């Protein structure tokens, strides 16, 4: 899970270069959110036919239900790892890998409304596009793959995030040490 704030339409009149960047970035972010909303809506012949992501999709289908997010959302409000039992009975671990909401809603937008959209310090706009950058790549990868990515990139799951996920997987230390030393192959599978 990535925590997002939905940004409503900004009322910024003016063509000062500082405003032009802030508005440019806010619209760039709003497009990604809109883009991601569009997405919710010799002897080989002997082998036989699997459904590679049937398991992952089955979990993904449950998340569409009314207020399944609130189960997730409340579980991770105080920590970044929790096990949630979904409506179908499946308990699945959930992880909060990024909190972009608190920066936007409680640091950026307050400064925008305070300074009438004329940002004084250019460093806050560069801060913003860097904060904003990962979510933009995540949405690009999904936009070009119809929502299903393989291998799992470092924007989808950073190297430390994956190594931490392995520790919490229901596997032997032989399995954890195997996966931990071959993350690049793990990503490919």
């Amino acid at each position, epitope marked *: 899970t990535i925590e997002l704030s*939905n*940004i*409503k*339409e*900004n*009322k*910024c009149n003016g063509t000062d270069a500082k405003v032009k960047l802030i508005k440019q970035e*806010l619209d760039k972010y709003k497009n990604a959110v809109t883009e991601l909303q569009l997405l919710m809506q010799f002897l080989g012949f002997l082998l036989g036919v699997g459904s590679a992501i049937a398991s992952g999709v089955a979990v993904s289908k449950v998340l569409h239900l009314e207020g399944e997010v609130n189960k997730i959302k409340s579980a991770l409000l105080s920590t970044n790892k929790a096990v949630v039992s979904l409506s179908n009975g499946v308990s699945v671990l959930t992880s909060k890998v990024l909190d972009l909401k*608190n920066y936007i*809603d*409680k*640091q950026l*937008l*307050p*400064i*925008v*409304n*305070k300074q*009438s*959209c004329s940002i004084s310090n250019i460093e806050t706009v560069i801060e913003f596009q860097q904060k904003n950058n990962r979510l933009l790549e995540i949405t690009r990868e999904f936009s070009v793959n119809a929502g299903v990515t393989t291998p799992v990139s470092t924007y989808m799951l950073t190297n430390s995030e994956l190594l931490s996920l392995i520790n919490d997987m229901p596997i032997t230390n032989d399995q954890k040490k195997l996966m931990s030393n071959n993350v690049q192959i793990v990503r490919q599978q």
Partner: antibody
Amino acid sequence: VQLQQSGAELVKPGASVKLSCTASGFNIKDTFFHWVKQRPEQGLEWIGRIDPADGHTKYDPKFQGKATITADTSSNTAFLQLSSLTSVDTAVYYCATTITAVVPTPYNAMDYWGQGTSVTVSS
Amino acid sequence: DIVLTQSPASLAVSLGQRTTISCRASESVDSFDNSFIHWYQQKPGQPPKLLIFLASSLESGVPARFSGSGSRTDFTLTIDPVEADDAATYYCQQSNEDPFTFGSGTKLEIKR
């Protein structure tokens, strides 16, 4: 712009009531709405807020079950349903939003207020 | 919940003098650089009118006779000079944490 709330209400104890707040001059999809309770000679109590664009709501838990906030973008109207009323629900109920602000936040101040709906609970 | 204590509960002020109202928070109401405190004026029969947003920002259309100050748990609304129209009740409000909470109010009376 204008937020026009529905008229005064007389409610039997135990019954329910649904209050309305119709917006003119702007589209409610583009901001957030709050409901605020003010009992006579009492303070202000924030009931909750809604994002009309997707139905997302957040309540003070004190009002959970008691207060239900909904919105309808089709008629540009926000609603507050109060359920199973008792005498402590007799109060003025306000609608509110941020409009006088560059970017609307759910955490922004409440700069526009409806005129209030006066709910009286009595047999 | 964050509890906001406003004092005095009521005060009398002469025309043209400056006066201050206090609002003290239970916990800090700051995120990053900003204080999420707001001040509203309410006259009988009307909804509140926003005067100051965040800590010190004057709402558009509000006379520059109103000012706000404060940083973490201690906040001040100042009216200077006081005018006859300023007789009303003033409320502070925080939005840094859910649920949003209001102060218990300070009633300003004009002395004549």
